[PDB]
Amino acid sequence: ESIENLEDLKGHSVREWVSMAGPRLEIHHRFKNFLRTHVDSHGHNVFKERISDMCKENRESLVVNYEDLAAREHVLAYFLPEAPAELLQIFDEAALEVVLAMYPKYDRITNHIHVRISHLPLVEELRSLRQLHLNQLIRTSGVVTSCTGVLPQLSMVKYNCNKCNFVLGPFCQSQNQEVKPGSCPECQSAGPFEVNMEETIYQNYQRIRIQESPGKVAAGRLPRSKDAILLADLVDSCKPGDEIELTGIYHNNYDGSLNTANGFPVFATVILANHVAKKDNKVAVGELTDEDVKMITSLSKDQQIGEKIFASIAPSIYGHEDIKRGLALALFGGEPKNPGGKHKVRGDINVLLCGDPGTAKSQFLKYIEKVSSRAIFTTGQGASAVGLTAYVQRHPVSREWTLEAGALVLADRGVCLIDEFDKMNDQDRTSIHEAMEQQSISISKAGIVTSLQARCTVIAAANPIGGRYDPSLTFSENVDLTEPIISRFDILCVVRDTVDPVQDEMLARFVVGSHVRHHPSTYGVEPLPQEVLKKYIIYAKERVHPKLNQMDQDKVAKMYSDLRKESMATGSIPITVRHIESMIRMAEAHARIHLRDYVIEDDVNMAIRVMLESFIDTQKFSVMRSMRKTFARYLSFRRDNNELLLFILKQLVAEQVTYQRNVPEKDLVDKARQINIHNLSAFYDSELFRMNKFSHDLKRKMI
Amino acid sequence: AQAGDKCDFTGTLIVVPDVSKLSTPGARAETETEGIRGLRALGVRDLSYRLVFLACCVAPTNPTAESIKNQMTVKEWEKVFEMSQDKNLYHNLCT
Amino acid sequence: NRELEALKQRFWKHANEKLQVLKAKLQEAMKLRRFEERQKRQA
Amino acid sequence: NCELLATCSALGYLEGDTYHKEPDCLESVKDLIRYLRHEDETRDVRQQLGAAQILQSDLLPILTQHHQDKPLFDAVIRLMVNLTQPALLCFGNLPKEPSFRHHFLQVLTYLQAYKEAFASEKAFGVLSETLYELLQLGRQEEDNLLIERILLLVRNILHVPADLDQEKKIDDDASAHDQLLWAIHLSGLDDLLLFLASSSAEEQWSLHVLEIVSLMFRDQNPEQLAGVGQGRLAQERSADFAELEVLRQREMAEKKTRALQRGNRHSRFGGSYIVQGLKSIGERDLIFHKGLHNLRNYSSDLGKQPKKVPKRRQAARELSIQRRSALNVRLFLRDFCSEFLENCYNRLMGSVKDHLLREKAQQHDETYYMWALAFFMAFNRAASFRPGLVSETLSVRTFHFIEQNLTNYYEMMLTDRKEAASWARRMHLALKAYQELLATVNEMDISPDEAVRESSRIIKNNIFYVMEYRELFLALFRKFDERCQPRSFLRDLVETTHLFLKMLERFCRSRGNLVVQSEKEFNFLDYLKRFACSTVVRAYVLLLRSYQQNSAHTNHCIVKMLHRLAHDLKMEALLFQLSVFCLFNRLLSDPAAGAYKELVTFAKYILGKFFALAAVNQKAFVELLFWKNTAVVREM
DNA sequence: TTAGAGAATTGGAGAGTGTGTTTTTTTTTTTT
Ligand SMILES: Nc1ncnc2c1ncn2[C@@H]1O[C@H](COP(=O)(O)OP(=O)(O)NP(=O)(O)O)[C@@H](O)[C@H]1O
Numbered sequence A: 001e002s003i004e005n006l007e008d009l010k011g012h013s014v015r016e017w018v019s020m021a022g023p024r025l026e027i028h029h030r031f032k033n034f035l036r037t038h039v040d041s042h043g044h045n046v047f048k049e050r051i052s053d054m055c056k057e058n059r060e061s062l063v064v065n066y067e068d069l070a071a072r073e074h075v076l077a078y079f080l081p082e083a084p085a086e087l088l089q090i091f092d093e094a095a096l097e098v099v100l101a102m103y104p105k106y107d108r109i110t111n112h113i114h115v116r117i118s119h120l121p122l123v124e125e126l127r128s129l130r131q132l133h134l135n136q137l138i139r140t141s142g143v144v145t146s147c148t149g150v151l152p153q154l155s156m157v158k159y160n161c162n163k164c165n166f167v168l169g170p171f172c173q174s175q176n177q178e179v180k181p182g183s184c185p186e187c188q189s190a191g192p193f194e195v196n197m198e199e200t201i202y203q204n205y206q207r208i209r210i211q212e213s214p215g216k217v218a219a220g221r222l223p224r225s226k227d228a229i230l231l232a233d234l235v236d237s238c239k240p241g242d243e244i245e246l247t248g249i250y251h252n253n254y255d256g257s258l259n260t261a262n263g264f265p266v267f268a269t270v271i272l273a274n275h276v277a278k279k280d281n282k283v284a285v286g287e288l289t290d291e292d293v294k295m296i297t298s299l300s301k302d303q304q305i306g307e308k309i310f311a312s313i314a315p316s317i318y319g320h321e322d323i324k325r326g327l328a329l330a331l332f333g334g335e336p337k338n339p340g341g342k343h344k345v346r347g348d349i350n351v352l353l354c355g356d357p358g359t360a361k362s363q364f365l366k367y368i369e370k371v372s373s374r375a376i377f378t379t380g381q382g383a384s385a386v387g388l389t390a391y392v393q394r395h396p397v398s399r400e401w402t403l404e405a406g407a408l409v410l411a412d413r414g415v416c417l418i419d420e421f422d423k424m425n426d427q428d429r430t431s432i433h434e435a436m437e438q439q440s441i442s443i444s445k446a447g448i449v450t451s452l453q454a455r456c457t458v459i460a461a462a463n464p465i466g467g468r469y470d471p472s473l474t475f476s477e478n479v480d481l482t483e484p485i486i487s488r489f490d491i492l493c494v495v496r497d498t499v500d501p502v503q504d505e506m507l508a509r510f511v512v513g514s515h516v517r518h519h520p521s522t523y524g525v526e527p528l529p530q531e532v533l534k535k536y537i538i539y540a541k542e543r544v545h546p547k548l549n550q551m552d553q554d555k556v557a558k559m560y561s562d563l564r565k566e567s568m569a570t571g572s573i574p575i576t577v578r579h580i581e582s583m584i585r586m587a588e589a590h591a592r593i594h595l596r597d598y599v600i601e602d603d604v605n606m607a608i609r610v611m612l613e614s615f616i617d618t619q620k621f622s623v624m625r626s627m628r629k630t631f632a633r634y635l636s637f638r639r640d641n642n643e644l645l646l647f648i649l650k651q652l653v654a655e656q657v658t659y660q661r662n663v664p665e666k667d668l669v670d671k672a673r674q675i676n677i678h679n680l681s682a683f684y685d686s687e688l689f690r691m692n693k694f695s696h697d698l699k700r701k702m703i
Numbered sequence B: 001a002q003a004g005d006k007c008d009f010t011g012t013l014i015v016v017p018d019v020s021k022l023s024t025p026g027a028r029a030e031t032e033t034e035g036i037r038g039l040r041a042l043g044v045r046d047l048s049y050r051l052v053f054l055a056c057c058v059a060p061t062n063p064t065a066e067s068i069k070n071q072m073t074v075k076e077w078e079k080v081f082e083m084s085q086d087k088n089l090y091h092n093l094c095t
Numbered sequence C: 001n002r003e004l005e006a007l008k009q010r011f012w013k014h015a016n017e018k019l020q021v022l023k024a025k026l027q028e029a030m031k032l033r034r035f036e037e038r039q040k041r042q043a
Numbered sequence D: 001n002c003e004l005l006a007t008c009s010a011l012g013y014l015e016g017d018t019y020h021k022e023p024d025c026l027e028s029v030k031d032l033i034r035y036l037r038h039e040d041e042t043r044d045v046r047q048q049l050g051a052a053q054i055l056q057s058d059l060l061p062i063l064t065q066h067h068q069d070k071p072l073f074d075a076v077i078r079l080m081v082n083l084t085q086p087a088l089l090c091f092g093n094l095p096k097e098p099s100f101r102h103h104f105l106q107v108l109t110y111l112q113a114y115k116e117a118f119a120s121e122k123a124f125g126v127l128s129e130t131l132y133e134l135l136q137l138g139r140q141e142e143d144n145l146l147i148e149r150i151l152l153l154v155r156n157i158l159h160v161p162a163d164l165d166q167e168k169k170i171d172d173d174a175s176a177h178d179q180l181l182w183a184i185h186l187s188g189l190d191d192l193l194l195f196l197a198s199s200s201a202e203e204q205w206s207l208h209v210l211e212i213v214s215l216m217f218r219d220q221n222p223e224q225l226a227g228v229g230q231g232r233l234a235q236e237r238s239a240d241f242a243e244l245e246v247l248r249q250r251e252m253a254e255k256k257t258r259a260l261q262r263g264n265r266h267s268r269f270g271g272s273y274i275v276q277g278l279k280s281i282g283e284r285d286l287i288f289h290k291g292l293h294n295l296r297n298y299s300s301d302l303g304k305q306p307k308k309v310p311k312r313r314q315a316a317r318e319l320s321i322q323r324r325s326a327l328n329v330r331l332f333l334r335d336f337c338s339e340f341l342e343n344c345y346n347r348l349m350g351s352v353k354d355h356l357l358r359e360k361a362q363q364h365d366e367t368y369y370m371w372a373l374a375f376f377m378a379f380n381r382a383a384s385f386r387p388g389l390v391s392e393t394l395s396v397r398t399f400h401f402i403e404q405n406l407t408n409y410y411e412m413m414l415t416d417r418k419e420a421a422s423w424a425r426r427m428h429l430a431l432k433a434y435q436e437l438l439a440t441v442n443e444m445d446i447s448p449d450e451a452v453r454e455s456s457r458i459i460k461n462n463i464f465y466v467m468e469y470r471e472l473f474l475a476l477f478r479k480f481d482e483r484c485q486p487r488s489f490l491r492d493l494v495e496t497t498h499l500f501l502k503m504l505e506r507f508c509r510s511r512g513n514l515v516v517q518s519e520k521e522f523n524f525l526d527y528l529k530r531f532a533c534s535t536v537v538r539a540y541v542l543l544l545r546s547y548q549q550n551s552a553h554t555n556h557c558i559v560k561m562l563h564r565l566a567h568d569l570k571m572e573a574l575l576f577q578l579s580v581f582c583l584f585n586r587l588l589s590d591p592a593a594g595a596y597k598e599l600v601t602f603a604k605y606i607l608g609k610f611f612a613l614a615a616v617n618q619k620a621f622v623e624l625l626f627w628k629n630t631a632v633v634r635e636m
Numbered sequence E: 001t002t003a004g005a006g007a008a009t010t011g012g013a014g015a016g017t018g019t020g021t022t023t024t025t026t027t028t029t030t031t032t
């Protein structure tokens, strides 16, 4: 059989070389070995795990990282950008017969597997593409401006003879011209032919136009653009408005239309795609590994996970712990539901940050834009009603009316960030009512009558009247927003830059510390790393769906009723059900933060606390004392419950010592799981059992 | 060269045919003044012409750390060094 | 010129087409592979 | 493909500037030789190995860095000889069908690549060092075999046609052949070739060394080569500027003549005229449409196209154009000619003629003999002339040898139809050698030595006494064909005929020379009246058509012979022809007519004689139309 | 030995075939 070789030395060109049988077989064997022997830094066989995660979901597409392909097999990384079509075909075959070794019945699911190359280091600016890059693998970035529909393209076509029954054998379709038979071998009739529509093999096709991102280099200049072709599983990888990162072969062909347009032998160009990522969706649940899931689920075991997550939001901002808490609950979000299959209620949580200048509200919005996937940002007069919701336009080539996505539709399962919300026009600001509650955008324009989905969490920032918040007035008395728009915000936040010299010293020292820490070169818990937090959020929003079975209905109802009573006398607006459902959503969000499948009393207490503290913040400064006493005493500011566990421990020890004289941690937690006091960890981190000389050990379990 | 720039171009004025009128073995034709006639490639059509400036060079008409390190000649190095060591450079630069 | 060179050093302290670079730095590793194969065969 | 790829890749790997060979590389090259010996008729293994560039990639590094491994080295030498074998030998003949001609072209392309690669000086350095050791040793069958294969490798690399589409290179830019010659010079193998030619101990290689020298000199001609002094570069700079200046001025003048020919109004500026005194092809007068400025110099073929003459009727054309080699290469080649003429010519040429006598030479090696006989004799004539250095080929035996070869090539040209052009090229070589011998016997009369003057008179007496050297020119003119022979052949033939008739005139006018051949009486004008034939004047006029492109000496020769034939023999009416009169019309209407004083004066003389005859009678116009035999005496 | 008449081979001119060909409504942003 054909003999193995040193690959990198040859007299041929690279394309000719890898086309020859000997080196083709050697490349095939090398890539097979690379797939079956590559390991992570920790020693995990990477591609066994990736192939199993592919064959479970039937994704029929294997993503490979160049930055370790180069580490394992040098010459394959050498030939890949030089002869990408040939090497990628060889990689596809090798990957297919590796996958059919791991899962022998997978040919029932798919007969062909595509190797998709990622993290290609030879990135190129979109306007910097030249003739030097032709027929080579490139990586570019840009915003998708246009997409065709997903269309069937011929791939292996059989032609019925124009005068008889015979099928002329398969022709491999190209992207340059429609392949044709000429004349039939059974009888040499010629010219037109019929495609056998049943036996012909088709492939998915989608042509997209991408241009430079508006903020990248187009500083008043017009942006350059390129066409790209997506084939097979790469279709529907992107939509218009997506900031994609595209790897593909820069391919060119003769175009007579361009020749007559320019008066020169000018060849059209197109990118044959090989991988599509997105620069906002830097992490996705379809890309999470078993180790990521393991370390996420290990982090959830920590009782401090709520505090860690709250401290992990915008860690370069001092203080504003209530703001970080509310933003965490909105960032994780509640659970949507439809009881009875006839009555929808939203799961998403809306936040409004009101306050005076220099208080990091816009900075919070920018942080949320950076951390969260599918996020968008807009400001004041820059936004419009039509752009926020959806717009109807003459289609560029068809010239028929077409509906197009606005802000809240492009963020249909993300976050829409609206900075300086008080300064919008009323016609712009009232457009988001349906999107904020009914989570649809209904359009009746130019013959289009349809409703789009807008399941978006709106987080907004604003200043009060005159810029400076005055504590002499209620929130409603100085915000200038109306009740229908205020009540749609689940969480109301007030930030005030009041003078307090010790707090000013702490804040200023932290700000100077941030400035010296981030040179180019209230937390008390330490944050998570932001990469870990992104993985945690994207895991929790998909792999967890908190259910509700019991939440102490009479407690919440009593709380809501006297909250309505107190609000009737003052200046913030708990419209009837929206605040009840805000509490339900916040309890579900807290359960999601803890990765709980079912909502518990602690989550309900947290939701009640958030609602009541926000409501107390909206009161006049003189009224806060009476209001805070009213809700704090009766309505469940459940700080801690150490006394019951102290006397339970003392009772159990008294009985045990009496028994001994005439595993105690197990004895303690048995009575603690019998009585509704199950969160025993607070008792162990509290001094009440310590000055009673009790202590704990997870190994010995003696106390 | 970008739009709005005032630039000096050097090259040659060339004549460019109406390529839409020419058929060839490579590719077919793609179809107010008269134009020329009689070529085999042109067929029965008539070929018009237009003037194009084939620019071999472009420059303005009036003109990073690595870029600074390369551009700074010895006189400029000495000048910026003397300015950095200039006492009361504050008031000197203000004036 | 030592102080001027020190100013240049401070400037460089603050100071902080690629297919061919890739090919060269990779061809170094392939040269290493050839050398190691040759040594192992000749040993 | 796969087995050949495996076996060739098995040989060795190249690291930077060094080559490391695998232990079984000897058996690998033996396998490659085995595949080459069992090729298909398409030369498939040669094609595949050339495509793989295994010669450049592996064999040249092995030659230049592992020549100490002798059993590998000789196998590598034989393999390179087989790979570099010329395509005409590979296929037997130039093919005539598309597929095999494509195969020929592919093999030839890989030969271009091999020749480009071998210009690296280390290859010929190793070859020259090896052959130096071998000739010091010279003796064994394997040793002389290795000498033969080294010489055949040098022959093979020298003998490839240059692909002048890619070698589309200007006046004295170094071609691939120039770089190869410079590599030979730097390696010192030229000194070994000189040693082989000068030494009497190994004369069997003299024929091969003659072939090597004949392939070294291909672009060059001796008259230009001998004049390359050390200060020639500055002179050629000024000459290039002057030539560009005159070319540009000539083009500007031609542009202005065209501009004044057409009007200053645009093309569609209409208007039509009738020329009342000029009948059309019908009965009515001609209607003219192209304007008064086209009428100012009216011609009745302004709107017409040329005729498509068929393939079997088209004239032959020159196979080369005179690009000079680089000036350093020209200096080296002049020095090589000097050393070859001084140290090597007599012994080598005697040895080659001895090889022809022994009849072990190949079927056309006397073409190389006659090439050298032309080239180095003409080199001796240029610059300081010395017959002593070149005495051997002045023998009458060489004249007889050239005459029999030329007549044999002439007969084979007239009979061997399928190969007639190559026989014409061989006859041209023989004619050039004959011309140069006429030149040197002319030259030595000017020398001051009485002994060589005696030798000159001896040679002239026997050569003009023997008739077959004399009648050969009439034979060549009578069966000259433009369809087979290029214009350079006719130019050389005219120059040779003028020189021969000049020397015969001088000999007969200074000495009696009363008998020829069995003696029979002889006079000079009797022989000159043989050239008063329609075919001869037709050929001379055919060369006269290119008077602008002809050299000044060629114009002098052609007008001198035609003026002799018209005036002294009193046969102007033979030259009365209408094509000849069109030639005279273009000559007289030439803007550069002042540069051709002898030609225009001769044209006016013959035209005046014609118009005298026309004034005598109207029959001259009809007789002017058709070529004419000895019945021309009616007109005279 | 040289030149003209009868027979053989191949170029291409011409016939036939196949194919190609301003003005109104509705929206959106910005200008006053
Ligand atoms: N507690 C804080 N910690 C760190 N930086 C802070 C803090 N408060 C304010 N800043 C800084 O203040 C600057 C302004 O932030 P920004 O988000 O624009 O404030 P703002 O709330 O939007 N004020 P305004 O736009 O007038 O309503 C940023 O550089 C913040 O980092």
Ligand SMILES: [Mg+2]
Pocket (backbone or CB within 6 Å): A361, A362, A363, A419, A420, A461
């Ligand atoms: Mg702000």
Ligand SMILES: [Zn+2]
Pocket (backbone or CB within 6 Å): A161, A162, A163, A164, A165, A166, A184, A186, A187, A189
């Ligand atoms: Zn059929």
